[PDB]
Design a binder for this molecule. Structure first.
Ligand SMILES: *[C@H](CO)C(=O)N(c1ccc(C(C)(C)C)cc1)[C@@H](C(=O)NCc1ccccc1)c1cccnc1
Ligand SMILES: *[C@H](CO)C(=O)N(c1ccc(C(C)(C)C)cc1)[C@@H](C(=O)NCc1ccccc1)c1cccnc1
Lengths: 305, 305
């Protein structure tokens, strides 16, 4: 029993973290096979930040201007390439610790674990969600750039996020591992609107199912609703619209608890309209939207890696 | 910026997790040097549970009755001993992945990371606190027994918790690595009172400082208070009494924010007496007590390992 914000075991990613330095700037890189991946703004200096011409800046760099350290081991850089907003440094040694891996571009509302790193050394691991507006609400200090987000499936690491920057609003922005930003963001020091966020409705419902499985059931009610009716309430409260695809992915949790999805929607509707009256659900006084339906079943089933 | 419930990177502990089998029962063990540590109730069968005679049960076992598997391959058990509530299986191979480590017994109110495992394989990592009543509010399914809690300091792992059981109330109990239970619990299937829990006051204050550091400040008020007067309110709201030692360990956070400890106490007093009125602090609608003062400084300073 119990329900925690649980991250993946970080060992397979820890063995991939290196330090990348280019002149003044140091940050983290990801060493997989014989390539190191890192944010391209490693080649900026403090006067480039407002609008760097990354092509012009990279042209002034040669292989030997990039220092890559894996623990105490020095990697020899034998090629460099820019792909979108990431730098790819070819090194002359394949990482002996390379896990089986893929690069994925996740969808808003999906979750992943973050291994926060400084100077190529891991400091902590935590779980978060890609917000509907393509920010993440992370914990990142100066120098955390190049930290990565990932999911693990048995033995295979799916890398989905590389950290690039903090916005003036204190939330975080980054790229997939092909260097394409999530959302509208660019890697320069300008004010950048993230735009309206919403609550991930399918995740809230998943977490209510997790609550019922753990015995927290006071919120269950005598009502039901329709998808159209519920979506009227969702929009009033800035929740994402629920689709039949969402209902389908909630099927296994509905089967385990015996609570039809539209009946759980009616419970959520009443919680939105009436609040929680100073009660809690799974230790929380707010509705939590950072657990996917897969997250709930994995934690309520014991899947290992 | 940002503040998350951050666990330690779990890589150094992942390489120590093995599967232990004694007849029917399988759980997790911790392989350090040439010894495997696991809960002694691995030697129980399903009729033993109400009050096992562990001495008698262990006498009917010999070295070859214990099967230790580290991923692929079996270890050879060459000795066995019971220490309090843990079994120590001497194996013929020192773990090549043994990190530098210590065994520590932690104090109520301290935090640690848990690596939840099943069948010797890591499934997830999360941070938690030893409650004042010596339970933990974990996430543990059947077979999680033997999962361990730990802290890391640079390269040294301090193991502080081994998971043993879930109480009928849904909370979790375990031992230090010398096999001494935290709290009054015994490893048998009986109803066991955990007794009254309290909120860890010094941790709540620490988290309020983390909030101010991250810009959340609506709760700072014009009042101050005394240690005596604050403890009056603390006792009404089932908070641990604040001592001068607690004031002292909050010193670094008080200095970094310019807010004297007793001033933060007056803010907490007003929060306890008036609630939050639909506001949030660091994304939470409850007062959080699972971050120690050291947890805050580490996450706000970027200490690596
Ligand atoms: C990364 C290593 O320098 C880093 O930590 N960092 C950062 C990111 C991007 C850039 C440019 C402008 C793309 C060159 C510079 C530095 C800081 C950071 O984001 N600074 C700029 C910033 C911060 C906040 C609001 C507006 C602008 C960083 C700090 C904390 C978390 N992530 C990144
Ligand atoms: C450990 C592997 O069997 C396990 O998961 N587990 C458990 C723990 C202790 C015992 C005895 C009674 C000490 C032999 C048996 C089994 C279960 C568990 O705790 N079962 C007993 C129980 C009693 C009261 C309330 C709940 C459970 C376990 C399940 C979930 C989390 N931790 C442990």
């Amino acid at each position: 029993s119990g329900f925690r914000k649980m991250a993946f075991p970080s060992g397979k990613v820890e063995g991939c973290m290196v330090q990348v330095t280019c002149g003044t700037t140091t940050l983290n890189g990801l060493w997989l096979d014989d390539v190191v991946y890192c944010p391209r703004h490693v080649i900026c200096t403090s006067e480039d930040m407002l609008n760097p011409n990354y092509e012009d800046l990279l042209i002034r760099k040669s292989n030997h201007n990039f220092l890559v350290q894996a623990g105490n081991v020095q990697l020899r850089v034998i090629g460099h390439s820019m792909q979108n907003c990431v730098l790819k440094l070819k090194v002359d040694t394949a990482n002996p610790k390379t896990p089986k891996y893929k690069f994925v571009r996740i969808q808003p509302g999906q979750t992943f674990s973050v291994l926060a790193c400084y100077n190529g050394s891991p400091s902590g691991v935590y779980q978060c969600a890609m917000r509907p507006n393509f920010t993440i609400k992370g914990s990142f200090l100066n120098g955390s750039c190049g930290s990565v987000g990932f999911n693990i499936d048995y033995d295979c690491v799916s890398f989905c996020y590389m950290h690039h920057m903090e916005l003036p609003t204190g939330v975080h922005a980054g790229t997939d591992l092909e260097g394409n930003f999530y959302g509208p963001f660019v890697d320069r020091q300008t004010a950048q609107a993230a735009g309206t966020d919403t609550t991930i409705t399918v995740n809230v419902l998943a977490w209510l199912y997790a609550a019922v499985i753990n015995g927290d059931r006071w919120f269950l009610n005598r009502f039901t609703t329709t998808l159209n009716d519920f979506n009227l309430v969702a929009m009033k409260y800035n929740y994402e619209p629920l689709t039949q695809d969402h209902v389908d992915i909630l099927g296994p949790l509905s089967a385990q608890t015996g609570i039809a999805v539209l009946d759980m929607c009616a419970s959520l509707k009443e919680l939105l309209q009436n609040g929680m009256n100073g009660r809690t659900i799974l230790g929380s006084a707010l509705l939590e939207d950072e657990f996917t339906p897969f997250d709930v079943v994995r934690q309520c089933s014991g899947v290992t890696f």
